[PDB]
Design a protein around this ligand. Sequence first.
Ligand SMILES: Cc1cn([C@H]2C[C@H](OP(=O)(O)O)[C@@H](COP(=O)(O)O)O2)c(=O)[nH]c1=O
Ligand SMILES: [Ca+2]
Length: 129
Amino acid sequence: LHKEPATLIKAIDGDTVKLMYKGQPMTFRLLLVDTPEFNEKYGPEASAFTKKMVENAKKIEVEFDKGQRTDKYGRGLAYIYADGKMVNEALTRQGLAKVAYVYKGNNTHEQLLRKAEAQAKKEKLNIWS
Ligand SMILES: Cc1cn([C@H]2C[C@H](OP(=O)(O)O)[C@@H](COP(=O)(O)O)O2)c(=O)[nH]c1=O
Ligand SMILES: [Ca+2]
């Protein structure tokens, strides 16, 4: 797995972000996580968490897994990194996201995220309170 560059176009919600990638606008859906929708509980907190994380980043990178790069809705599927810190993992650690939509082929960082979730649960953080 390798990181490629990309620029914020726009925050969208907890687990989606508009990025410019290879000079094209594209909606990215975070691999292996599920944030609440904005209208659900901790949804706005999730949205704000991701928003602030990508918005304050000097360097946004995109990392595809070995499997599918696009979903059935045309959204990019990637791990997203904000100055070297993975958004997917950071949401999970803070209990603003659950591990989810784990498909074999696109699962390189599963254990790492389950590790993060386990620690969020332990602290009964946000969603787990
Ligand atoms: C995270 C992820 C979601 N999806 C699809 C499956 C879900 O389909 P359905 O709409 O058929 O339930 C949908 C969930 O995304 P959201 O949580 O953004 O809705 O996005 C993938 O296909 N691959 C993935 O890696
Ligand atoms: Ca969601």
